[PDB]
Design a binder for this molecule. Structure first.
Ligand code: MG
Ligand code: ZN
Lengths: 209, 171, 848, 50, 175
DNA sequence: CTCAAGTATCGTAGCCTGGTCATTAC
DNA sequence: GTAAGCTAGTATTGACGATACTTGAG
RNA sequence: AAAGACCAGGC
């Protein structure tokens, strides 16, 4: 290994890392997904799906841990430049399937400004990602910190103390890394406790805005 | 080349006036872009071999040969057989005369007045143009350095006579 | 009311909070008083002695230059005991407003205590101050209550004291420490200056001499009564200095501990009384001894100078002709010349006068003495200097020209001589270039601190600690922070209180080290100001500069636990990444006639083998790229219709010049769609379209990585961009830089380094590698990670220039930057962004 | 006339803390005997029409 | 920045106000190496004394033995033939390889075959007062060129000539 | 039928206090 | 009325950010 | 009056 290079296909390895990243983000978000559907090798991935894998034979993912009616899917894509008629037809068959509460669209090379408004009208809440953003797990990095979201009652009890109206708080934008990694809506309030030799024993509270 | 008169400025440029053209030679004389091969045959040279003798390439250097054959076959793409008698001279007549504020002169008196003052014959002006092009090609290949204006061998110092002359000419 | 400008001089024998005012100033400035009960007789005495200048009863200003009834305004002249406030004209003097008590003299200057030079950052070489004179009574109360010296004793930028024992006082303490005992006459003469009583002698009787005190009993003569405190190197008990440990490396810190003991438990003014009794005692101790320096102090021996010159001509000069030809990352020069400078300092601190007149642990002040006694060191280089490289080449050629006596006997950028023995004319010119560059950088370069302070005050002006304790903006009434300190609450008071303008304090604590760094303009203080600007001046719009494309890649640890296997993985990934193209191997392009015209790209045989490339590789890596470029962006690229390629190890066509005769490797190409009736247009298409696009084809490595070099890191900064991994210190890293043509929007360089690292990615430490710029960390890891990294970088840069800045101002700066939602800068691009996105009135008195 | 000043005898020594921060201490009797004694002439000008 | 006031605080301020030189620039604050000493200042401009404000390095001071040349009014081109210079013929057909070009104030006036005899004979005729004293002769081996300057504005300085230096012994040491 | 972009320009680039002068008549 | 004879007519030390235009192509 | 232009001292 000290000087080894893997003489295999890279695109199967890219779909492997991106699919385990999707599974990881669902498991750390909280939904029940199968163990070791995360924890599997690259080699047995290459045995089960090949070296040049097809995308519609993906992992149709599972539902909520404690709730039952909250279920979700993933949709992978092809390489070339995309047009939104594909997304509307696949959304028609998605809503025809059984029932969901959303899905993750992992795109490949481009999203369209015609696309985001033409997926905005659908009857659930879906996400759009990028295939090259999903390689390294950002919550496995050393510099990452915990973002424990507090309940609506704890939000009320914090707004009790300082007599404030939620737009005088410090903010965190919704097009942020950890905000889309946990799939947070506007108006939730998250806290973070800092470790680090100038900011130890220091906590912060931000409102998604 | 600069001088006293503002009508004496003479520039030879090595550039692309445009795929992927070879770099060619251009003359900016009397606010008029002229190919340098036309000016060579206008000053009185007879052959391309003696024109590249006037430049004196010192051999080799295929970029120099590429630039001179591109400038030849670009000279031939502007005037139809400029090498025949007074064709290039008529070309620089109609190229000088069409400018903004043309000079009150024919081209022969224009050459004897505003082209390289201090030289006698047009033969010597062709030789000086070949020396100028040799200097440019030698700087191109990295054998010559560009002038920097911080080296004081490129500077003159003006005191009371030089300033008082300039002030007195205005009034 | 009134103002006054005057030249300052010093006076060590009056009190710290006293200012001496010239009589010409004092007899023309007035103070106004409202005459009423408890001051009829006292003001009547003054008007009888013609010390009141003017008067007004009602409104009609009748002059006196009249008896007193209660209710009019007397304007008397300045006398002893009044309060003025002092300010040097605040060019950088942002917090120097001090309140002082007035005495009058006959000279022309303004006299202040020498302990007040560092709170004002003034010296006695021509400086002038402005004195202001408060007229209203509520203004007198505000000046006396906020800006007095005992009120302002503990600093608000750092946690330290604004009053430190300096030049002559510390030297007096050092010479009082190297001899320990004092006889009776000088001890009683010193005891005349103490506020306490002289103790019994520590030594009552020896058989040799008489009684003798120690200097601890002299130093204790300034304490207050019944003091008992404790610190690091001292024990004080019962107002007696019981213990004080040895040192000269500790002495100033022990004095600072004694003063903070007194000002933690002693009074309302007792630390000032301590200084007011200590300083004249130390002057009167040093005065019957004197202190000087001779030529012997400045003359290094012949042996030590021979060792210095031998270490230079052995180590420094053969290296400097190697690693200066490389690029900027090799500052090994500075470490090695610092080792030789350490040797020189160890030599020169054998003279007793020189070690008492400097701070030994300081390094900016110890390089200046090495330049005088020994060599000057490096004076010319072509890295981040304000002059160009043509000047450096001209100076190297001039070095060849002038030392015609055995040229290249050393380097041209190293000066070997000293100031004490004199420079050559060449060494003088080389030193004069470096001095001129420092002077220009210090004078012209004072506009970026000037801009930074304006944009810092424009955003940080209205951030106040409120009455409930939350640090809030006041124009928008939004929470910037929930607590300013970490132990402040309504049971425990602290250094900061409600109503404090903490934003202005943060802005000034940020602007001070910037101005200090530029006014010094050392290489270290230049690099620190660079590191500070790279945090404080970020841009919310993507500018895709050089730092935006840089990525640091880390590695794993211990292949099979064998020695020398981590560098092998480093070059494995380097050999996978690094870009070398076909034109890096091409030498000539030879068009042949045998359809008819056939091009021969000729190669070099050796660099194919030194990089392990074969020719079928080059055929593949040309063919895939040319078929992609005829597939991508299909217009004006129909020259590759049926163009042909071919490969051979040997062709030997060998056109007229520079033959290799055999195995000159050749990539033949041709065309077949150009069925032309002329050769002259075929030569145009094969020499002006195809041959350009066939040169920039890359053969080994990835086409998007512009560079990927290996740095050993290990800068004894211990993982400068890591926070908690291990106690390891010697990792080797790759600093990948992507080409400009690939990064389009922000965050792309990480995306194209990870995707191009994909077949070798089992070797890279995925959980540790990060980008280089702080906005790219914000794009990759999020806003909280960017906040913590901005604190961690700003702290290092500010600690390199000026030591001990409090963490509260840095945390407030990083909170105010990232309060809008995304990290913004202190420039116009950040200011208009937030502007688009978006004490007084604190209490009220009334009767009861 | 290339040199404008005096030859003063200088000692390098501390003087009760009165020469700190680049101050100097001078001699009273050397000043009374005429060292560094200076004359100064100022001109005040005015014009009218004739 | 052309005409200044004369200062009379002491005679030295008046002396150094008359010996200054200036490089005027457009926006003061973004120049190249104009503010720095160049090695071609040696002996003619002081590299130690300069202002420190905005005019740092842009205003120079003359050295002590520095002289500014003036224009030579006599014709000099016809006395160049006596040292081994030949004419520039008019045929544009003859090649001139090996010969060095001579340039008088930038104007090409002739060629010379041996250049290490032409220059050494011109310099010997200048040291005997039949050529003007302010005439600059530069031999250029790489460009194959001999440049001669006789115009105004050049900075000169005196130097000892070593090979003529033995002519003091036989003279008399009167001042 | 619009983003980006490749130019095409605009405009500020050290800043503040002192003292001074010399200020087109037509 | 001065426009700064007509004056050049690009034909000589600045150099970046910041805003505004004429391409191809989904 | 107001601006230009210069010089000096700091930052
Ligand atoms: Mg000072
Ligand atoms: Zn070949």
């Amino acid at each position: 290994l000290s000087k080894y290079v893997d003489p295999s296909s890279e695109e199967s390895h890219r779909y492997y890392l991106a699919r385990r990243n999707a599974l990881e983000m669902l498991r750390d978000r909280g939904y029940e997904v199968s163990l070791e559907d995360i924890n599997l090798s690259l080699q047995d991935f290459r045995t089960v799906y090949g070296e040049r894998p097809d995308v519609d034979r993906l992992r149709i993912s599972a539902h909520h841990r404690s709730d039952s009616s909250n279920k979700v899917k993933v949709v992978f894509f092809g390489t070339g430049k995309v047009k939104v008629n594909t997304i509307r037809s696949v959304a028609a068959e998605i809503l025809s399937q059984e029932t969901i509460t959303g899905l993750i669209l992992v795109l490949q090379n481009q999203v369209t400004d015609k696309a985001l408004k033409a997926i905005e009208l659908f009857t659930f809440k879906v996400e759009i990602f990028q295939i090259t953003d999903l390689l390294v797990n950002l919550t496995k990095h050393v510099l990452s910190l915990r973002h424990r979201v507090l309940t609506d009652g704890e939000k009320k009890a914090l707004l009790k103390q300082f007599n404030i109206e939620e737009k005088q708080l410090p903010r965190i934008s919704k097009k942020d890394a950890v905000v889309r990694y946990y799939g947070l809506e506007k108006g939730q309030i998250v806290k973070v406790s800092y470790r680090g030799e100038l900011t130890e024993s220091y906590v912060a509270y931000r409102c998604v805005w | 080349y600069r001088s006293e008169t503002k009508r004496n400025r003479f520039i030879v440029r090595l550039s692309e006036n445009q795929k992927r053209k070879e770099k060619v030679l251009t003359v900016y004389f009397l606010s008029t872009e002229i190919p340098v091969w036309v000016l060579f045959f206008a000053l009185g040279v007879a052959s391309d071999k003696e024109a590249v003798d006037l430049i004196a390439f010192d051999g080799g250097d295929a970029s120099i040969t590429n630039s001179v054959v591109a400038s030849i076959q670009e000279a031939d793409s502007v005037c139809e057989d400029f090498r025949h008698g007074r064709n290039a001279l008529a070309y620089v007549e109609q190229q000088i005369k069409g400018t903004k504020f043309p000079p009150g002169e024919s081209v022969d008196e224009c050459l004897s007045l505003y082209l390289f003052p201090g030289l006698k014959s047009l033969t010597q002006k062709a030789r000086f143009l070949g020396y100028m092009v040799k200097c440019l090609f030698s700087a191109y290949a990295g054998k010559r350095k560009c002038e920097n204006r911080d080296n004081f061998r490129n500077k003159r110092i003006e005191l009371a006579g030089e300033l008082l002359e300039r002030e007195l000419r205005v009034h | 009311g009134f103002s006054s400008r005057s030249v300052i001089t010093g006076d060590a024998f009056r009190n710290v909070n006293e200012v001496g005012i010239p009589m010409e100033i004092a007899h023309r400035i007035t103070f106004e008083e409202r005459v009423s009960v408890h001051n009829i007789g006292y003001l009547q005495e003054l008007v009888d002695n013609k010390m009141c200048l003017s008067y007004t009863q009602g409104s009609t200003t009748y002059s006196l230059r009249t008896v007193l009834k209660p209710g009019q305004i007397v304007h008397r002249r300045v006398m002893d005991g009044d309060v003025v406030f002092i300010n040097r004209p605040p060019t950088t003097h942002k917090h120097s407003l001090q309140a002082l008590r007035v005495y009058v003299h006959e000279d022309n200057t303004v006299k202040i205590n020498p302990l007040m030079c560092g709170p004002l950052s003034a010296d006695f070489d021509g400086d002038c101050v402005h004195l202001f004179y408060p007229q209203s009574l509520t203004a007198k109360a505000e000046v006396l209550e906020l800006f007095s010296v005992d009120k302002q004793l503990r600093s608000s930028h750092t946690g330290q004291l604004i009053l430190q024992l300096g030049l002559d006082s510390l030297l007096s303490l050092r010479v009082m420490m190297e001899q320990v005992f004092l006889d009776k006459a000088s001890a009683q003469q010193l005891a005349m200056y103490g506020s306490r009583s002289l103790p019994s002698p520590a030594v009552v009787k020896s058989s040799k001499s008489g009684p003798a005190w120690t200097f601890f009993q002299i130093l204790q003569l300034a304490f207050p009564e019944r003091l008992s405190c404790r610190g690091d190197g001292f024990i004080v008990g019962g107002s007696d200095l019981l213990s004080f440990d040895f040192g000269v490396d500790a002495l100033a810190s022990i004095i600072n501990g004694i003063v903070t003991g007194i000002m933690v438990e002693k009074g309302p003014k007792e630390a000032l009384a301590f200084f007011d009794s200590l300083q004249p005692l130390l002057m009167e101790h040093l005065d019957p001894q004197g202190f000087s320096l001779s030529l012997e102090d400045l003359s290094m021996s012949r042996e030590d100078m021979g060792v210095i010159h031998n270490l230079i001509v052995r180590e420094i000069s053969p290296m400097v002709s190697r690693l200066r030809l490389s690029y900027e990352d090799e500052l090994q020069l500075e470490n090695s010349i610092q080792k030789v400078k350490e040797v020189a300092a160890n030599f020169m601190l054998k003279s007793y006068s020189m070690r008492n007149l400097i701070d030994i642990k300081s390094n900016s002040a110890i390089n200046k003495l090495v330049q005088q006694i020994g060599f000057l060191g490096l004076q010319l280089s072509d890295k981040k200097k304000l002059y160009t490289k043509t000047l450096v080449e001209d100076m190297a050629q001039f070095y060849k020209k002038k030392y015609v006596s055995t040229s290249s006997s050393g380097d041209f950028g190293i000066v070997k001589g000293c100031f004490f023995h004199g420079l050559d004319p060449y060494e003088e010119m080389a030193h004069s270039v470096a001095a001129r560059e420092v002077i220009v950088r210090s004078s012209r370069g004072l506009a970026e601190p000037g801009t930074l302070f304006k944009n810092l005050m424009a955003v940080l002006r209205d951030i106040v600690i409120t009455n409930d304790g939350t640090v809030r903006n006041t124009c928008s009434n939004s929470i910037v922070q929930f607590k300013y300190e970490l132990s402040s609450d309504n049971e425990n008071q602290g250094l900061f209180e409600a109503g404090d303008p903490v934003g202005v304090l943060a802005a000034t604590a940020m602007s001070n080290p910037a101005y200090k760094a530029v006014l010094d303009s050392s290489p270290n203080s230049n690099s620190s100001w660079e590191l500070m600007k790279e945090v404080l001046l970020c841009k919310v719009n993507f500018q895709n500069t050089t730092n935006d494309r840089r990525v640091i890649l880390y590695l794993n640890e211990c292949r099979c636990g064998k020695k020398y296997c981590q560098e092998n993985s480093a070059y494995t990934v380097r050999n996978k990444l690094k870009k070398v193209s076909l034109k890096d191997t091409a030498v000539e392009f030879l068009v042949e006639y045998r359809i008819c015209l056939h091009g021969h790209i000729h190669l070099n045989k050796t660099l194919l083998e030194g990089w392990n490339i074969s020719m079928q590789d080059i055929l593949q890596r040309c063919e895939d790229a040319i078929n992609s470029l005829v597939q991508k962006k299909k217009k004006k690229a129909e020259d590759f219709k049926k163009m042909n390629l071919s490969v051979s190890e040997c062709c030997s066509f060998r056109g007229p010049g520079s033959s290799k005769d055999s195995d000159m490797p050749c990539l033949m190409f041709s065309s077949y769609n150009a069925t032309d009736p002329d050769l002259e247009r075929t030569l145009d298409v094969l020499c002006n379209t195809i041959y350009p696009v066939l040169l920039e084809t890359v053969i080994k490595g990835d086409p998007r990585i512009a560079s990927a070099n290996i740095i050993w890191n290990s800068p004894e900064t211990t993982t400068w961009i890591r926070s908690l991994h291990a106690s390891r210190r010697g990792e080797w890293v790759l600093d990948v830089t992507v080409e400009k043509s690939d990064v389009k929007q922000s965050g792309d360089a990480w995306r194209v380094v990870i995707d191009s690292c994909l077949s070798v990615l089992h070797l890279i430490d995925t959980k540790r590698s990060i980008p280089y710029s702080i906005k790219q960390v914000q794009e990759l890891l999020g806003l909280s990670c960017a906040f913590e990294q901005a604190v961690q970088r700003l702290s290092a840069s500010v600690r390199k220039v000026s030591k001990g800045v409090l963490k509260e101002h840095i945390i407030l700066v990083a909170n105010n930057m990232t309060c809008s939602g995304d990290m913004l800068g202190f420039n116009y691009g950040g200011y208009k962004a937030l502007t688009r996105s978006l004490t007084g009135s604190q209490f009220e008195l009334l009767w009861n | 006339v290339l040199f404008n000043g005096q030859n003063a005898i200088v000692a390098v020594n501390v003087h009760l803390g009165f020469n700190q921060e680049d101050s100097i201490v001078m001699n009273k009797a050397s000043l009374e005997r005429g060292m560094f004694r200076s004359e100064q002439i100022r001109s005040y000008k005015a014009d009218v029409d004739s | 920045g052309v005409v200044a006031n004369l200062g009379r605080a002491n005679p030295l301020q008046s002396l150094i106000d008359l010996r200054r030189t200036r490089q005027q620039v457009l926006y003061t604050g973004r120049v190249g190496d104009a503010r720095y000493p160049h090695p071609s200042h040696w002996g003619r401009l002081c590299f130690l004394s300069t202002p420190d404000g905005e005019n740092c390095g842009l205003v120079k001071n003359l050295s002590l033995l520095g002289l500014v040349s003036t224009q030579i009014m006599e014709p000099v081109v016809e006395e160049l033939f006596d040292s081994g210079m030949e004419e520039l013929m008019d045929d544009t057909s003859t090649p001139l390889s090996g010969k060095h070009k001579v340039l008088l104030n930038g104007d090409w006036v002739g060629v010379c075959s041996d250049s290490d005899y032409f220059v050494a004979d011109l310099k010997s005729r200048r040291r005997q007062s039949e050529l003007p004293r302010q005439m600059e002769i530069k031999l250029d081996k790489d460009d194959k060129e001999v440049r001669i300057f006789t115009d105004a504005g050049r900075l000169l300085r005196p130097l000892l000539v070593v090979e003529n230096l033995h002519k003091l012994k036989q003279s008399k040491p009167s001042k």
